[PDB]
Amino acid sequence: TSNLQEQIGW
Amino acid sequence: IQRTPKIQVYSRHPAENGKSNFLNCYVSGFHPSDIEVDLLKNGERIEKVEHSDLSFSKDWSFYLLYYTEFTPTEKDEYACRVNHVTLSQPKIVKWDRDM
Amino acid sequence: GSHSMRYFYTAMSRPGRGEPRFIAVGYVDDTQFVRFDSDAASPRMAPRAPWIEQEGPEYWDGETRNMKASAQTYRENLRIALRYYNQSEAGSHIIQVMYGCDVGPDGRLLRGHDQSAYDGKDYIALNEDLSSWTAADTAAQITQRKWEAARVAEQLRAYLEGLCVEWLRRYLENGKETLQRADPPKTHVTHHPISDHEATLRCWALGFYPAEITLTWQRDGEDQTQDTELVETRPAGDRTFQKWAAVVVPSGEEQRYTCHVQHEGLPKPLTLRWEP
Structure with missing residues (x-):
């Protein structure tokens, strides 16, 4: 199962 | 910034004439990801060609397997034709039973 | 023996040809088991190995929603990277990401991984301690500061030591006839x-x-x-x-x-x- 995208981003 | 593809053309099983097999063209080690690959039968493009999902190696370079099912004969010549931004013109690698 | 699970993301800008393509693949050892492609007619996390097909619709819906979220995040990261490297909006660029866990024969965590690249070069990597970062250059140091401020490593560590290892153990059992079979040359x-x-x-x-x-x-x-x-x-x-x-x-x-x-x-x- 993939890691949940928390979307802080670069 | 850019890496040119390595190319291997080979069959899934040892080839014997008249028996069904798979023709493989493995392109690897390239960057960036856009790449054009044709499988050729006597110099002409084979239509029913599938490929693996794009993935990449630990050095970030990409690899893909193109494949199609075929029945080799003694006369028929097979090859893989590859174009990539690193290549001035398409590379054609001929299928050699022995490699 | 030992085993690994890995997810690989590739985000590929193409100015003038729509939004960046996002593709994800998942592996256990050398066996691919899922894929996602934003260029599919109906993008979804899709099975690529027989032993994952038994996962229920909740699994596939959750994975699809996560990859859509990741696609949006990495499209934004491509725009951010242009600013960090003073690059024009006319060129095509690539972000790549690899992450996952390695386990020993008894299923315990050996090592976690989370690394990213920009245009085929290392950008930032989570260190083996799963708590600090190595940034390749002064652009990745901005990301590093951002992730240190938001305690991003703590979330990765929890994933890598927990869900990553637990799902790998489940996949290894469900696919044991192939994933746990070595075929000699x-x-x-x-x-x-x-x-x-x-x-x-x-x-x-x-x-x-x-x-x-x-x-x-x-x-x-x-x-x-x-x-x-x-x-x-x-x-x-x-x-x-x-x-x-x-x-x-x-x-x-x-x-x-x-x-x-x-x-x-x-x-x-x-x-x-x-x-x-």
């Missing part, structure tokens, strides 16, 4: 005259799984490292891999040469020679 040596004076001895390994293998040529028991041609291990298309190693030998001296094969599937390493 079928091996043979061929001989090709080049001239009156030399011939090629080629040592073949076929039909093996996993891909890791060692093929070496010795002459009089001395490794022929510099004089061996070694092709990259290549997929056969049926789960298995292929490899060969070749040496050019003086005519008549064939029997001074031996091929040595090591693979997980072999109880003992093999010594082969050409047998006319």
Whole structure:
């Protein structure tokens, strides 16, 4: 199962 | 910034004439990801060609397997034709039973 | 033996040709088991191995929603990277990401991984402690500061030590007939005259799984490292891999040469020679 995208981003 | 593809053309099983097999063209080690690959039968493009999902190696370079099912004969010549931004013109690698 | 789970993301800008393409693949060991492609007519996390198909619709819906979220995040990261590197909006660029966990025979975590690249070069990596970062350049140091401020490593560590290891254990059990089966190489040596004076001895390994293998040529028991041609291990298309190693030998001296094969599937390493 993939890691949940928390979307802080670069 | 850019890496040119390595190319291997080979069959899934040892080839014997008249028996069904798979023709493989493995392109690897390239960057960036856009790449054009044709499988050729006597110099002409084979239509029913599938490929693996794009993935990449630990050095970030990409690899893909193109494949199609075929029945080799003694006369028929097979090859893989590859174009990539690193290549001035398409590379054609001929299928050699022995490699 | 030991096992790994890996997810690989690739985000690929194409100015003038729509939004960046996002593709994700998941692997256990050398077996791909899921894919996502934003260019699919109906993008979804899709099965690529038989033992994942039994996961229920909740699994597939959750994975699809996560990859759509990741696609949006990495499209934004491509725009951010242009600012960090003072680049124009006209060029095509690539972000790549690899993450996952390695476990030992008893299923305990050995090592976690989370690394990213920009245009094929290392950008930022989570260190082995799963708590600090290595940034490749002053652009990635901005991301590092951002992730240190938001305690991003703590969330990765929880994933890598928990869900990553627990789902890998589940997949290994569900796919045990293939994921936990080593297929040994079928091996043979061929001989090709080049001239009156030399011939090629080629040592073949076929039909093996996993891909890791060692093929070496010795002459009089001395490794022929510099004089061996070694092709990259290549997929056969049926789960298995292929490899060969070749040496050019003086005519008549064939029997001074031996091929040595090591693979997980072999109880003992093999010594082969050409047998006319």
